[PDB]
DNA sequence: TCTCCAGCTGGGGCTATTTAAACCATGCATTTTCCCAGCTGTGTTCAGTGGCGATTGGAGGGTAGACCTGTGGGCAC
């Protein structure tokens, strides 16, 4: 959960693009919602 | 004869050379200093997260109530 802060929104956006997350979530670009979604996707 | 004048007849001041001394003017060139700009470092603030605490929800256990079955007693043939 920690290194997900160092993701520093922009690289987390690129990671969500890499996993295949739909563009709406990426579009929101939440600093907290984005990291929760990428933690969920890395759990999936 | 004496005075004046007027030309002219032989006489003095330019030029050329070397040298040192101390001096000057007129933009020029160089060196120094001051100022401004940029880059780096440190400090502060903000916000993420960690972490912990509290509240809510779910599950399990216990107690209470109700229903069903069994036994006993009373009554009737």
Curated annotation (Swiss-Prot):
Record's comment on post-translational modification: Phosphorylated by casein kinase II in vitro.
TM stretches of this protein: none
Compartments, record wording: Nucleus
Top-rank taxon, per record: Eukaryota
Assembly with partners or alone: Component of the TFIID basal transcription factor complex, composed of TATA-box-binding protein TBP, and a number of TBP-associated factors (TAFs), including TAF1, TAF2, TAF3, TAF4, TAF5, TAF6, TAF7, TAF8, TAF9, TAF10, TAF11, TAF12 and TAF13. Interacts with TAF7; the interaction is direct. TAF1, when part of the TFIID complex, interacts with C-terminus of TP53. (Microbial infection) Interacts with SV40 Large T antigen.
Pathology linked to this chain's protein: Dystonia 3, torsion, X-linked: An X-linked dystonia-parkinsonism disorder. Dystonia is defined by the presence of sustained involuntary muscle contractions, often leading to abnormal postures. DYT3 is characterized by severe progressive torsion dystonia followed by parkinsonism. It has a well-defined pathology of extensive neuronal loss and mosaic gliosis in the striatum (caudate nucleus and putamen) which appears to resemble that in Huntington disease.
Family: Belongs to the TAF1 family.
Domain notes: The Bromo domain mediates interaction with histones that have acetylated lysine residues at specific positions. The second domain also recognizes and binds histones that are butyrylated and crotonylated.
Function: The TFIID basal transcription factor complex plays a major role in the initiation of RNA polymerase II (Pol II)-dependent transcription. TFIID recognizes and binds promoters with or without a TATA box via its subunit TBP, a TATA-box-binding protein, and promotes assembly of the pre-initiation complex (PIC). The TFIID complex consists of TBP and TBP-associated factors (TAFs), including TAF1, TAF2, TAF3, TAF4, TAF5, TAF6, TAF7, TAF8, TAF9, TAF10, TAF11, TAF12 and TAF13. TAF1 is the largest component and core scaffold of the TFIID complex, involved in nucleating complex assembly.
Protein name: Transcription initiation factor TFIID subunit 1
The organism of origin for this protein: Homo sapiens
Residues included from the entire protein: 1013 to 1056 of 1893
């Amino acid at each position: 959960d920690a290194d997900l802060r160092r993701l520093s929104l922009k690289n987390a956006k690129q990671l969500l693009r890499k996993f295949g997350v739909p563009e709406e979530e990426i579009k929101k670009l939440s600093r907290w919602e984005v990291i929760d979604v990428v933690r969920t996707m890395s759990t999936e």
